[PDB]
């Protein structure tokens, strides 16, 4: 029983809309285009927020011959630590970083940043796939049909799916408060006041 | 999956309205032009507030021969520092500044102001694009059809989108209360009270 | 993307009303006259209250050959400080100032007053333009059609616009309580307790 595929997700979205399942995706003669665009848009909307499975740490960026930083096509957000660079303030603009404080598009040295990428469908994990599918189906039905009872049922299912996805994310990636900013290499032992008293 | 483009945003607005998708954007024969107009209007409405990605600090402004300050066609707001300029306070009027204390349109030297610019669709970051898309879709649907339950649903989606956008902005920019007004260079270490106790 | 113009404002008002957008303003064959009169009336109603972008400080007034103070025709209100002049109580009456305490229309010397002016549409800033447009649209629809759901939608939109306009005004005008009456030149430093404890 392998992981969910794109065709299975499209079939689930159509079924939640209330139509008959479709055979394939290629050269379809049905709603495959609408299902595909809905799934892609919801995937992008979920990914652009930034989670633990699509974020890189302390990645180096290299400038071009004109001292200008150009991002890739699928870079959603770029964060620069303030304390490390007290004289430079950057904000993403289109596909180039912008030196907000000095009002320049040029830099003096390479940077160490942490960026969030948007991933293709094939590379997503299972819980992300589930949440994406359910949210896309709800959005498509709400925009297309607009009935009442179907909207209620989709609302309940979406709430349950969001709860499950958030719980899975947090138990996988073990967020903590003592460690503080994650860019610091872990000095924490998280010793357990619940065990060693005997 | 790249960042949202103009054609994708137009198709999304049309789909939210509930009408068939379009093929391109040039030489079309539908409501795509009205969707474009609504997108531009909502973009202007959102950008005229002043956020992290479209504000330039410490910017220096230059005067013309007749001792006047002229602004570009896409400048939304300017702020001068009261502490830095005690005897002169300015308020924007059209494309020129007015020294409201001295009742003159003429200044004596140059100014160092904070400037907010209205940007084109290309330079906008992802979260701003998403918020703009959803808001424009809701407004256009209300203007065209005029339902109430549809407005309720779009209000729910807009509230969720605004929450996501605000969370993204406050995670990106890293605002603070200790630092005070940001025109002063950061002397704060924000030394962590939590970890370094072992 | 320049600022909003009169034609865009009337198009927005008509769109809020629910009609088809109109092309021009001159020699129109639609609701252009009603939309224009609503926009002008709402602009005057908003401007007569007195804000930070249309007020002149310590302006000097000059009497005529008969010791009469004649105002311009677009002067909304005139305020004279009581402490400075302890023997005259002046109130506006039509276009000339009246001495309430002494029951005379004649003065003895020129005055230093704070007066408010009504600005034309061209000179207004962006937030004022936005708020004026939305309020005028709501008023016209309410007085012309009078339906229910349209009224509630316009109510929600107007509430949001008012919130945005007020916030923009306050952050642009940095009102304070320690400074006291703004007529005095700033002796304040607003020494922040947030910063200098290290």
């Amino acid at each position: 029983a392998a992981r969910t595929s794109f065709l299975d997700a499209v079939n689930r979205v159509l079924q939640m809309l209330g139509e008959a399942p479709v055979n394939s995706l290629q050269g379809q003669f049905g709603l495959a285009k609408q299902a595909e665009v809905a799934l892609n848009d919801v995937s992008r909307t979920i990914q652009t927020e930034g989670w633990s499975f699509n974020t890189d740490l302390e990645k180096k960026l290299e400038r071009n011959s004109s001292n200008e930083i150009e991002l890739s096509s699928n870079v959603s957000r770029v964060v620069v630590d303030n304390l490390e660079y007290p004289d430079i303030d950057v904000v993403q603009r289109g596909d180039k970083l912008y030196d907000r404080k000095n009002n320049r598009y040029t830099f003096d040295e390479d940077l160490i940043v942490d960026m969030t990428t948007i991933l293709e469908w094939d590379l997503l994990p299972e819980h992300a796939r589930q949440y994406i599918t359910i949210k896309a189906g709800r959005q498509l039905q709400e925009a297309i049909i607009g009935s009442a009872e179907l909207t209620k049922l989709n609302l309940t299912q979406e709430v349950e799916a969001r709860s499950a996805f958030l719980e899975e994310e947090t138990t996988k990636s073990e967020h903590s408060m003592l460690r503080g900013h994650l860019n610091r290499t872990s000095p924490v032992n998280t010793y357990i006041p619940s065990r060693t008293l005997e | 999956a790249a960042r949202t483009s103009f054609l994708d945003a137009v198709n999304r607005v049309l789909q939210m309205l509930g009408e068939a998708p379009v093929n391109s954007l040039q030489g079309q024969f539908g409501l795509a032009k009205q969707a474009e107009v609504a997108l531009n209007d909502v973009s202007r409405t959102i950008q005229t507030e002043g956020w992290s990605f479209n504000t330039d600090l410490e910017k220096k402004l230059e005067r013309n021969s007749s001792n006047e300050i002229e602004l570009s066609s896409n400048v939304s707001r300017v702020v001068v520092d009261n502490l830095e300029y005690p005897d002169i306070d300015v308020v924007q009027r059209g494309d020129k500044l007015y020294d409201r204390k001295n009742n003159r349109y003429t200044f004596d030297e140059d100014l160092i102001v904070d400037m907010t610019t209205i940007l084109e669709w290309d330079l906008l970051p992802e979260h701003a694009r998403q918020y703009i898309t959803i808001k424009a879709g809701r407004q256009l649907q209300e203007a065209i059809i005029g339902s109430a339950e549809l407005t309720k649903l779009n209000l729910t989606q807009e509230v969720e989108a605004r929450s996501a956008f605000l969370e993204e902005e406050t995670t990106k920019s890293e605002h603070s209360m200790l630092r005070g007004h940001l025109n002063r260079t950061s002397p704060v270490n924000t030394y962590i009270p939590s970890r370094t106790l072992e | 993307a320049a600022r909003t113009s009169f034609l865009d404002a009337v198009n927005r008002v008509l769109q809020m009303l629910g009609e088809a957008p109109v092309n021009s303003l001159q020699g129109q064959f639609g609701l252009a006259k009603q939309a224009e009169v609503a926009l002008n009336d709402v602009s005057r109603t908003i401007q007569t209250e007195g804000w930070s972008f249309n007020t002149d400080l310590e302006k000097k007034l000059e009497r005529n050959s008969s010791n009469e103070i004649e105002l311009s025709s677009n002067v909304s209100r005139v305020v004279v400080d009581n402490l400075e002049y302890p023997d005259i109580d002046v109130v506006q009456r039509g276009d000339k100032l009246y001495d309430r305490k002494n029951n005379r229309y004649t003065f003895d010397e020129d005055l230093i007053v704070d007066m408010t002016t009504i600005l034309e549409w061209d000179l207004l800033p962006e937030h004022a333009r936005q708020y004026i447009t939305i309020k005028a649209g709501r008023q016209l629809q309410e007085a012309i059609i009078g339906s229910a759901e349209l009224t509630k939608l316009n109510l929600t939109q107007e509430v949001e616009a008012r919130s945005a306009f007020l916030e923009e005004e306050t952050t642009k005008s940095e009102h304070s309580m320690l400074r006291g009456h703004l007529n005095r030149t700033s002796p304040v430093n607003t020494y922040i307790p947030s910063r200098t404890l290290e």
Binding site: I145, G146, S147 | I145, A148, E149, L150 | -
Partner: protein, 51 residues
Amino acid sequence: MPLISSSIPNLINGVSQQPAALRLASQAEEVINCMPSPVEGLKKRPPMQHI
């Protein structure tokens, strides 16, 4: 916004040239090679044989 529906009872009323705002909604617009009958509705026309 009520999301509401109707139905077309019969398809056996042929072609009309009137403007769309004055017709019975039953009436069609273009009919070719159909044999509308009241015993089985709309169907493809019978074939033509050779002698």
